Amino acid sequence: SKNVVIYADGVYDMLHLGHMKQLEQAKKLFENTTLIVGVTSDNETKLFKGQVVQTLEERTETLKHIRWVDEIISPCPWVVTPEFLEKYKIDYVAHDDDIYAWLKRAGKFKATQRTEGVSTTDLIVRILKNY
Template identity: 55%
Template sequence: MNKEEKQVRVYADGVYDMFHYGHARQLEQCKKLFPNTYLIVGVCSQEDVEKFKGKSVMDGYQRTESVKHCKWADEVVYPAPWIIDEKFLNDHRIDYVAHDDIPYQTADVDDAYALCKKLGKFKATKRTEGISTTDIIGKILKDRHKYLKRNIERGMSRQELGMGLWEYYQLKYDWLFCQGRKRKQD
């Protein structure tokens, strides 16, 4: 890298719940926008996530720690604002904000990135097809009983799993029945 190349401060933000390869690819795109990118990643506050998106699987600390361990992130900001203002841009000396180009609406604004776009400080990234936190949660819910059985097998109590007594014993019995049948076949 040429020492004379100016470092460009790029900011990317998100919820980053259940951090997955789609998130990592977004940050990789951001990091590779310029030859000398310093990537600041904002993790939205728990309060804003619940207000604008709903319940997250991971809390703010867990989401932040996940992002901190991504090799593309140079710095992590928590809590990050849902809507970026000029003060935030100036305080963090941000040259560009990078995010996918879908308008993120709230009750107050049509696009959380409108200011950055207006100022010419917005760089669009592409979403990774086939992966999202919503998809992962959907798969878990679809196969809910399989995951409950798995955790019963690992010794979790019905209270830890938030299960009623009937459902717990029904799944536990099914698991024991299947295990017994497998042993007989072996």
């Protein structure tokens, strides 16, 4: 079967098992895929979403070590556009779930899910119940 190009963007701050499971899910959407991961810039993340603890460089270098990741766009645009899809020959956008209505209308949206409790901040909440 033909190779399907998947695009998954995010902040990927302090990458945890929840991110990794989501990337695995996107990678395995079809039998033969190329998973492109977009890593959002420090400025736009801070401005649109909130404080980021790791720089773009740190967030990107970590993602390079993940099995499911085939290609990285870093920094990636904050908003996916139709032109972006055509520029990188993206077949589907894989994201947790509006702003994706236009993708779903075109058949180009694949929902992936989060894993609760696994996150990095929750692991400190752990060691902080040693007292």
